[PDB]
């Protein structure tokens with residue numbers, strides 16, 4: 083039945099695309115039939131691969147109402163896509179119906195990330211963090227959210243190209259404009275909560291072509307989400323660390339375009355965090371708190387906004403970038419986004435379900451070749 | 456014979472000590488008999504554990520004359536220490552002879568690190584980098600050099616305490632003075648090679664106790680070696696990146712003492728390195744070059760000095776610190792030393808030979824749970 087369908091498509095590996103391919107495959111003669119032939123296999127493959135790992139979750143997380151809802155959305159979308167596997171690519175009605183289905187799935191899966199996050203809240207509310215399976219939850223969520231980002235990318239591209247900027251990709255994404263947009267939105271929320279906010283000091287270096295505007299091929303909303311998250315963190319740190327003084331140091335952002343890397347470095351004077359404690363910030367169980375209640379006029383704390391640091395790092399890593407933190411405890415913190423400057427180096431990073439993935443859920447990863455202390 | 460002796464002591468695990476224990480065990484009533492009872496077991500254990508891994512090296516590396524020499528030094532030292540296993544701790548002559556043996560071994564093992572490094576040079580000269588075993592060489596060298604650092608620490612402590620500052624530990628190591636010493640020695644060599652050098656801009660924050668000198672319990676030479684390495688790197692980068700202009704930006708160092716971390720951050724404007732290429736800098740095969748020839752009056756390139764980046768990071772990690780690089784390609788690089796501010800958190804990080812270690816030499820570590828591209 084459904085287990086048989088999931089098993090069939092989970093045998094296959096997802097096929098990673100580059101940003102250059104996304105761009106090229108949807109510009110001149112963007113071909114809906116070609117997208118159909120690809121996506122009627124690729125979407126079931128990507129859904130089925132991650133659905134196998136949902137099934138490996140600790141029972142107390144798997145059974146939460148929010149996870150059950152996400153799983154039922156994936157099951158229903160898988161079945162609806164599989165209705166097309168035996169249609170002909172020259173059947174115009176089948177092509178039109180497939181695009182309608184993609185658009186429908188795109189809307190249905192619109193709040194997958196907040197709903198999975200609420201399952202994690204339900205889980206640690208009703209049972210706590212079982213330490214034995216907590217490595218499994220961390221491993222799963224990195225892969226589920228990356229999978230979701232990759233599925234959203236395909237749904238967006240097909241819906242935007244054929245539901246009637248290349249799709250959601252801007253071939254000339256203006257990096258500094260996105261950064262200023264992130265700063266202004268974060269500052270607005272900072273002002274509401276702290277009644278003040280740090281100024282922005284922005285510096286840029288186009289090493290590739292000095293003095294020229296810094297542009298890359300990118301999905302602007304991905305960059306926005308990452309820079310918003312980092313501004314929010316640096317503002318919370320600055321405003322709370324210097325609350326007694328009432329004088330708030332600026333947040334400095336340094337943007338550099340090198341031969342290979344676009345780098346966005348954000349520096350604050352928020353007092354920092356010791357190295358021992360920094361990796362908790364990328365842990366889902368540690369970083370998920372119940373969302374603020376609706377029924378209040380009081381300003382929402384900054385922690386109540388954004389995708390969070392782990393998902394932000396996944397956005398960077400999705401196209402072979404990264405997001406790294408390094409702090410000087412007592413002084414402040416540097417946060418750095420790395421993005422590939424070239425669209426041909428920007429290849430999807432996708433999880434795959436196989437024996438190695440399954441073994442991860444059933445092994446303990448203890449570095450016994452070094453002394454414990 | 457010797458295999459039987461190595462096998463016997465390699466069954467045991469090394470016993471990590473904290474800096475606070477090193478300090479306390481050698482101050483009031485520093486007891487030579489107590490050190491003897493500990494070290495006549497601990498030194499054979501640490502030697503035997505790493506000797507088992509020497510034996511796992513690729514034959515073409517193991518058979519180099521330099522590795523054979525290091526191995527013969529370890530074999531001879533192991534046997535000489537084992538002569539004491541059945542002596543009585545109340546035999547004053549045995550105690551005196553043991554201290555003499557420790558002092559002798561300390562001198563004999565004095566150039567273990569340069570000799571092992573020359574074996575690596577011989578290896579990649581005569582056969583190249585066999586890609587199948589190159590993961591093994593990297594794994595081994597991290598562990599061999601850390602082991603050597605730990606054995607040197609024990610030999611130094613016993614020799615300095617009983618061969619007649621607590622041993623080699625300064626309970627009040629003046630961090631900024633060591634940093635300036637590293638800068639001045641690096642600058643001297645930079646001037647000789649480039650006929651100019653960057654200035655030092657030094658800033659400090661004692662968050663723990665503002666305005667007070669920054670001091671920690673530490674081994675000053677370990678800190679010196681790390682900061683020298685980083686100065687040398689930042690000077691090479693600055694002088695070569697700005698050679699055309701003839702104006703050289705300073706190297707900025709920011710020292711912070713937090714509740715938990717002593718941090719030393721070194722920033723340069725040397726043009727940086729892309730993220731994809733930064734990890735090669737910690738790879739022994741990549742970072743080992745033949746040493747400069749003696750028979751020349753020409754200034755020695757900066758790369759010919761120091762322990763190198765991998766060993767420098769091992770020095771940081773030896774007492775639960777770290778050494779991290781983050782670069783903005785096109786602009787410059789930040790290098791950060793992390794040191795535990797408290798002697799009780801500074802616990803030896805020691806490799807141990809067991810089934811997990813052996814499996815590392817006989818497995819391939821391929822992240823098959825993610826798509827390759």
Ligand SMILES: Cc1cnc(Cl)nc1-c1ccc(N(Cc2ccc(CNC(=O)C(F)F)cc2)C(=O)c2ccc(O)cc2O)cc1
Nearest residue numbers: 096097098099103107108113116117120236239240243828
């Ligand atoms: C055209 C289109 C529009 N919108 C979307 Cl979301 N996707 C597409 C699309 C993307 C890839 C393909 N693939 C699938 C595909 C999959 C992977 C790759 C490269 N990556 C790998 O091989 C991976 F396995 F490592 C390239 C192409 C093709 O084989 C293909 C590409 C161009 C073309 O003119 C005709 C085609 O049939 C087809 C359609």
Ligand SMILES: Cc1cnc(Cl)nc1-c1ccc(N(Cc2ccc(CNC(=O)C(F)F)cc2)C(=O)c2ccc(O)cc2O)cc1
Nearest residue numbers: 312315316318319322323350352353354355384385415417
């Ligand atoms: C993870 C997170 C999520 N949402 C929000 Cl609003 N803030 C955080 C968060 C922000 C800053 C930090 N800290 C540590 C920290 C924690 C609390 C404070 C405020 N408290 C005080 O200083 C006062 F208690 F002394 C300051 C700094 C950093 O140094 C830091 C981390 C990431 C980053 O991108 C930028 C950063 O500055 C930790 C968590």
Ligand SMILES: Cc1cnc(Cl)nc1-c1ccc(N(Cc2ccc(CNC(=O)C(F)F)cc2)C(=O)c2ccc(O)cc2O)cc1
Nearest residue numbers: 455469470471472476480481486489490493609612613616
């Ligand atoms: C006194 C001395 C001088 N110089 C040197 Cl290099 N070492 C020593 C020395 C260090 C430790 C010990 N150990 C060995 C030892 C080993 C490990 C630890 C802590 N670490 C662990 O247990 C490790 F396994 F995790 C503590 C002590 C003791 O058991 C010991 C300590 C103090 C004392 O007054 C009497 C003693 O017999 C003995 C001598």
Ligand SMILES: Cc1cnc(Cl)nc1-c1ccc(N(Cc2ccc(CNC(=O)C(F)F)cc2)C(=O)c2ccc(O)cc2O)cc1
Nearest residue numbers: 685688689691692695696723725726727728757758788790
């Ligand atoms: C690893 C190493 C060993 N010994 C010596 Cl003398 N230098 C190096 C080395 C130094 C700097 C780098 N680069 C990259 C690099 C390489 C060459 C140059 C010089 N060449 C040019 O800029 C010119 F070609 F354009 C500059 C920067 C850095 O950005 C960097 C790395 C570590 C560090 O602690 C500090 C750093 O600045 C790489 C290797």
Ligand SMILES: [K+]
Nearest residue numbers: 092093094435
């Ligand atoms: K699969």
Ligand SMILES: [K+]
Nearest residue numbers: 465466467808
């Ligand atoms: K052992």
